[PDB]
UniProtKB/Swiss-Prot annotation, chain B:
Name of the protein in question: Surface presentation of antigens protein SpaP
Residues forming coiled coils: none
Keyword Transmembrane helix: yes
Classification via InterPro entries: T3SS_IM_P (IPR005838), T3SS_YscR-like (IPR005773)
Swiss-Prot record, chains C, N:
Subunit structure: The core secretion machinery of the T3SS is composed of approximately 20 different proteins, including cytoplasmic components, a base, an export apparatus and a needle. This subunit is part of the base, which anchors the injectisome in the bacterial cell envelope. Forms a stable homooligomeric complex. The complex is composed of 15 subunits.
Name of the protein described by the UniProt record: SPI-1 type 3 secretion system secretin
Organism: Salmonella typhimurium (strain LT2 / SGSC1412 / ATCC 700720)
Observed phenotype of the null mutant: Insertion mutants are hypoinvasive in the HEp-2 cell assay.
Places the protein is found: Cell outer membrane
Reported function: Component of the type III secretion system (T3SS), also called injectisome, which is used to inject bacterial effector proteins into eukaryotic host cells. Forms a ring-shaped multimeric structure with an apparent central pore in the outer membrane.
Entry's family note: Belongs to the bacterial secretin family. T3SS SctC subfamily.
Regions annotated as coiled coil: none
From-to range in the entire protein, with total length: 53 to 103 of 562
Superkingdom, taxonomy of origin: Bacteria
From Swiss-Prot, chains H, I:
Taxonomic placement: Bacteria, Pseudomonadati, Pseudomonadota, Gammaproteobacteria, Enterobacterales
Protein species of origin: Salmonella typhimurium (strain LT2 / SGSC1412 / ATCC 700720)
GO biological process annotation, one example: protein transport
Keywords: Protein transport, Transport, Virulence
Protein name: Protein PrgJ
Role this protein plays: Required for invasion of epithelial cells.
Domain of life, source organism: Bacteria
Keyword check for Transit peptide: no
Record gene name: prgJ
From Swiss-Prot, chain L:
Family assignment from sequence similarity: Belongs to the SctF family.
Cellular component GO terms held in the UniProt record: cell surface; extracellular region; type III protein secretion system complex
Gene: sctF1
Record keyword Secreted present: yes
Stated consequence of mutating residue 61 to E: Can secrete only early substrates. Can assemble needle filaments in vitro, but shows a filament assembly defect in vivo. Can invade cultured epithelial cells
Effect of residue 72 to A: Shows a specific deficiency in the secretion of the translocase SipB/SctE. Shows fully assembled needle complexes. Is able to invade cultured epithelial cells
Name recorded for this polypeptide: SPI-1 type 3 secretion system needle filament protein
Subunit record text: The core secretion machinery of the T3SS is composed of approximately 20 different proteins, including cytoplasmic components, a base, an export apparatus and a needle. This subunit polymerizes and forms the helical needle filament. Interacts with the needle tip protein SipD/SctA. Interacts with the needle adapter protein PrgJ/SctI, the secretin InvG/SctC and the minor export apparatus protein SpaP/SctR. In vitro, the needle protomer refolds spontaneously to extend the needle from the distal end.
Induction line: Negatively regulated by PhoP-PhoQ.
Organism: Salmonella typhimurium (strain LT2 / SGSC1412 / ATCC 700720)
Keyword annotations from UniProtKB, A to Z: Protein transport, Secreted, Transport, Virulence
Length: 89, 220, 51, 102, 79, 88, 221, 90, 90, 68, 50, 75, 68, 51
């Protein structure tokens, strides 16, 4: 049990369009990197891969990860898909 | 992923997005104005439509950004409790008022009201005395009434701007024709003499900067 | 009548003119129901009228 | 005024008047928008400004959930002496038959 | 005529998460049995509890699996 | 006979396809039908409907041309359509 | 759904829906009138087709919605209504009259009669009496015969409307050309001068208001 | 049979705009759905409901109906937007 | 062998419009299907039919035939629609 | 789910009852012979039911997935 | 075949393997004709404009 | 009808009378449950029945799966 | 067939014949063991045929689409 | 006839001209059937006429 939280993380005002990207990109890449790591070290630990109460947690974590990355991919593709049609047309 | 019917609604909206931009945003106007500039200068293929539309799309984002930001924080960031049909309906509707107000700022009332009555379809053929050209309002028209009135207003505004832009270049070439007829040289077409003059006139005016600035200033 | 009245979208298309006396509304309502081709009901709180 | 909120709450473990005491100690109670219901039962209606409604609904739901850890049914033991009869069951071995009195 | 909307207990479930009685009781029954593996009265109890725990855990896993396939199939329907 | 409706739909689309070759050139010449006016998704939908409205044979029996070289036939029909477009 | 074939038919219909809108709805007419206006002003690429089709589809919604809603509640309706093959086929057929009445109300009687007779002569043989229903109650004609008559009728009337709108701009053009010849500036391309006069004329008329009003009032009293 | 309600009268179309009818339809669907998901989840946790053969035969039907309902809506909406793409992009 | 009937000269001197041919096909199929589903369910409910080998061996064939029929109708319909799309679609 | 507009539990109680009789005197051969039959029939009933409900789910899903 | 032999042979695996060939081949033939006619008309329009 | 019923029937026209014999032997045995002569016959008939019904059902299952594969490859 | 029109034996026959022989005496191990392998070989043949027909049609559909 | 009459769409395309009595309708109806090529049935509630 060793835990830390970073609290003063984000600015809520209206801000230039360039930086909303950097801040979204960075926060997302960080979240996915740590999520993936915790998944793998839940499988490598023998006390967690063999307990039926723990496996049920790992199942949810894996599924949530799958869905989150599927959705960020889909919406980004439709985002650039709009621009390319307005410009080509 | 929250409620999945909200997920379906989000993906649907995301698919229709380019037509909404193409018909309910000032992109409509900027796209037309820049092409008319090219026609008034009489150029047939340069700058590319790829370039002119890229510029118009960029500029319109500055104008629309303040609204999308507010809608985002209102819907997605705030957690809220709601429990029934009426509470949800009201909650959802209230989020759109930031956009609704923009449309009503740039749309023409008697046409919006006509479309409202047309979609109630009530008692129809209601007379001009059913209206009295009132001035100050707390009405909240439908968005399906507001979108086409907006489109049809923006187009007319663009045509009006295009009227003024043609005039100086029209003068520039009738002068050239008259001088060539003052000489004997009536066999020669003005166009090859007239084009460079128009290009210098336009750069001396720096028309691109005055246009972009003034187009933005209308929405501030 | 002392009751709120709800009129169907279809029946609201009909028109009328003249000078009328609402002396006994239940009776007048019954009269005009047949002349105009309406049907009506009363649940105890409001009067609903249909084509 | 058009922003008024209203909600129905149902509690299983806590009485309406018990919740009132919580609000009063908190210094959150507001006599313009008091709770409406049966002091003895666990169901009530509340309406008011957004902040007040949300706080009430959350607080009450948490009170009710935490009271799933409390227990009421403490057992008690009574010791009762019989004055007129023997406590135990008896068996009478009749020379012909065994018979039992519980 | 249309069926009623129902009404939504939005807050309750997500913070109703907490240590289940059922696992606690399974581990307690096992610890009682292991002290005297030959008592029929304890064996009869543990058979029943272990069985119920098996059923519960399977039903839950299959349900989580079904609910997440629907969401993956929606997203794959729009991309 | 179970598959008969399936085949009957395919006979329909083969007849419409061979009719398009003769109807579309007319839509090219006339001043109220050319693509300066009628364009996009309506255009094919309307041409096909007209061709089916005028095809001469019952639509539910096998097309007679299955045994013939397709190109000479398509060119023949397009030439006929060009002649009609001129006369109209 | 309570029945599987009822589901298959619904997915097929939902797969063919766009062509039905493209060929059997006023969209076919609005789309033409706006392109005619753009031709009249002598423009090439602006407004874009995507903008004009956008407004054309929105305006078509106000006109078609009531019968689509009517058909929807008619087929949802939960009250017991059919028992057997003849009652089901009649129930389905009866559900389409809300839309047959629409096609018939705007199709040209002469075209409807032509496409009907030419089907009778396919099925029953050309010797069957040519009907000449000159005074007519057209006996619920088949929708495959009725639909192309509507399509050509709307094309006709849209072209007709588009013609009227040219005549002012035609005047403008011939006038400008005459005054330039009166000055002898034979080498001046008129289009440069006449384009802005057309634009300001249309703006002074307020064309889009008048036009979008009248186009809708033609479909409802 | 424990607690039930139904909505008897639907408001006249003559007073409601075209977009209100949409908001009102959407909201009702989104709520009936969240309520069904919650109901199933709660059935899976009551130990009486999760271990009785009678009750499981019900849960299996409830989950099959939820699955078919959401697959239906998600298919027809995709066809619906595909029509608009076909007409405008083309 | 029970209640057999056949139509004769179906197309010999009258021909249906396609508009009607589709409608008759749809109706004749949809009702047969709904009756087969009810027959199956009833053969499952009756305690005397789900416990006799002779009756179970009959029910297995009914379920197999229903499943094959509905799959074939669905596949052919989808394939036939595809061809009309490839015809109309610009 | 009903097809809109179309015109057109005892075994559980029986097993419960037999169980209650048996539980009172587990050594009676007649109560044992009866319970064996009731329990066997109930078992077969529940299995046949749940298999059929799955077969219908999978046909509806295959139909949708064919057009999806 | 109209009321001769029998209908509904959805089920015998030997005839059901003969139907697969026909059901595929006729769909391909019809699909091909649709393209050839468009090509032909397009060639005529190409020449007449140019 | 159908081919899978044809396969099912090809068994029932194969075992002419077994379906009757089994019930008849059962009635006799039930009349005198303790006669070894009766018992010995019933054991045989019952076994022959159990086997017939299992072979029939597994064969129908296999031909069903062959057809369900082909109807998918129609697509 | 008895018929040729002028202008060995296959697994389809052998299966029908072995089923026909088996059904006369469903409890003989020689016949059962002779039938298992014919029904297996017929299942494999009838799958492999359909899968390759499907591959050749998807090739031709892709060609036509590529030249659209 | 004293009974409602239903005429099929196909039969409704024929035309007739002249001056008729209808004195004995059941006889007249039969005679006309064979001249025009019609067939007809009577269930007891309505008369159905077909080509
Ligand atoms: C220019 C616009 C093109 C990309 C549009 C981005 C729209 C996606 C936003 C979204 O919904 O995902 C949020 C997504 C999730 O953030 P969260 O939900 O707030 O946690 O945030 C991101 O991951 C942003 C990813 C941006 C990557 C695209 C980079 C743009 C093009 C390369 C620059 C040159
Ligand atoms: C030009 C368009 C021409 C046709 C348009 C209709 C498209 C549907 C064609 C589907 C082919 C049916 C193949 C079924 C295969 C089979 O054997 O099943 C028979 C099967 C049983 O056969 P039986 O032995 O006769 O009982 O019956 C059916 O299930 C038929 C399925 C009917 C579903 C049709 C749904 C109609 C929706 C389309 C309506 C839209 C109209 C707009 C027109 C086009 C846009 C302009
Ligand atoms: C037909 C007369 C054309 C004269 C030039 C028109 C103005 C543009 C070019 C000169 C601009 C004045 N400047 C900046 C050089 O001083």
């Amino acid at each position: 049990i060793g835990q830390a939280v970073n609290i003063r993380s984000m600015e809520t005002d209206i801000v230039s369009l360039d930086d909303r990207l950097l801040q979204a990109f960075s926060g997302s890449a960080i979240a996915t990197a740590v999520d993936k790591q915790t998944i793998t070290n839940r499988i490598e630990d023998p006390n967690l891969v063999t307990d039926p109460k723990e496996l049920a947690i790992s199942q949810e974590m894996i599924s949530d990860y799958n869905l989150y990355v599927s959705m960020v991919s889909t919406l980004t593709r439709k985002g650039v898909g709009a621009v390319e049609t307005l410009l080509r047309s | 992923m929250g409620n999945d019917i909200s997920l379906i609604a989000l993906l649907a909206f995301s698919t229709l997005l380019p037509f909404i931009i193409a018909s309910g945003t000032c992109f409509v106007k900027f796209s037309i104005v820049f092409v008319m500039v090219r026609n008034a200068l009489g150029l047939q293929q340069i700058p590319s439509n790829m370039t002119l539309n890229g510029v118009a799309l960029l500029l319109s984002m500055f104008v629309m950004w303040p609204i999308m930001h507010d809608a985002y924080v209102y819907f997605e960031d705030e957690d809220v409790t709601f429990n029934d049909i009426s509470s949800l309906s009201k909650h959802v509707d209230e989020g759109l008022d930031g956009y609704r107000d923009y449309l009503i700022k740039y749309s023409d009332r008697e046409l919006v009201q006509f479309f409202e009555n047309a979609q109630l379809k009530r008692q129809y053929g209601e007379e001009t005395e059913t209206v009295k050209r009132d001035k100050d309002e707390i009405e909240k028209p439908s968005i399906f009434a507001l979108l086409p009135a907006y489109a049809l207003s923006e187009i007319k505004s663009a045509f009006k701007i295009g009227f003024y832009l043609y005039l100086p270049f029209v003068v520039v070439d009738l002068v050239v024709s008259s001088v060539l007829l003052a000489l004997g040289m009536m066999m020669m077409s003005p166009v090859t003499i007239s084009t460079p003059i128009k290009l210098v006139l336009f750069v001396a005016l720096d028309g691109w900067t005055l246009l972009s600035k003034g187009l933005i200033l209308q929405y501030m | 009548l002392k009751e709120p009245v709800i009129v169907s979208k279809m029946a609201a298309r009909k028109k009328i003119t003249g000078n009328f006396e609402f002396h006994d509304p239940n009776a007048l309502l019954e009269k005009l129901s047949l002349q105009l081709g309406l049907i009506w009901y009363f649940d105890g709180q409001a009067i609903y009228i249909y084509d | 005024a058009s922003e008024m909120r209203n909600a129905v709450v149902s509690l299983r473990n806590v009485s309406l008047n018990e919740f009132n005491n919580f609000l009063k100690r908190s210094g959150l109670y507001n006599k313009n928008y008091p709770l409406r219901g049966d002091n003895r039962k666990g169901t009530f209606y509340v309406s008011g400004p957004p902040v007040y409604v949300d706080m009430v609904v959350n607080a009450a739901t948490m009170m009710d959930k935490q009271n799933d850890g409390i227990e009421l049914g403490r057992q008690k033991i009574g010791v009762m002496r019989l004055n007129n009869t023997f406590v135990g069951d008896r068996t009478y071995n009749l020379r012909d038959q065994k018979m039992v009195i519980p | 005529a249309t069926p009623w909307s129902g009404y939504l207990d939005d807050v309750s479930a997500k913070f109703d998460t907490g240590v289940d009685n059922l696992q606690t009781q399974v581990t307690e029954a096992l610890d009682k049995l292991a002290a005297k593996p030959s008592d029929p009265a304890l064996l009869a109890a543990y058979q029943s509890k272990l069985s119920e725990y098996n059923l519960y855990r399977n039903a839950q896993s299959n349900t989580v699996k079904v609910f997440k396939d629907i969401d993956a199939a929606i997203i794959q329907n729009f991309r | 006979m179970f598959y008969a409706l399936y085949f009957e739909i395919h006979h329909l689309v083969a007849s419409a396809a061979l009719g398009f070759a003769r109807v579309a050139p007319i839509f090219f010449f006339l001043p109220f039908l050319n693509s300066g006016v009628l364009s996009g998704a309506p255009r094919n939908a309307i041409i096909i409907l007209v061709a089916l409205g005028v095809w001469p044979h019952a639509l539910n029996e096998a097309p007679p041309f299955l045994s013939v070289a397709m190109i000479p036939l398509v060119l023949q029909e397009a030439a006929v359509g060009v002649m009609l477009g001129c006369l109209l």
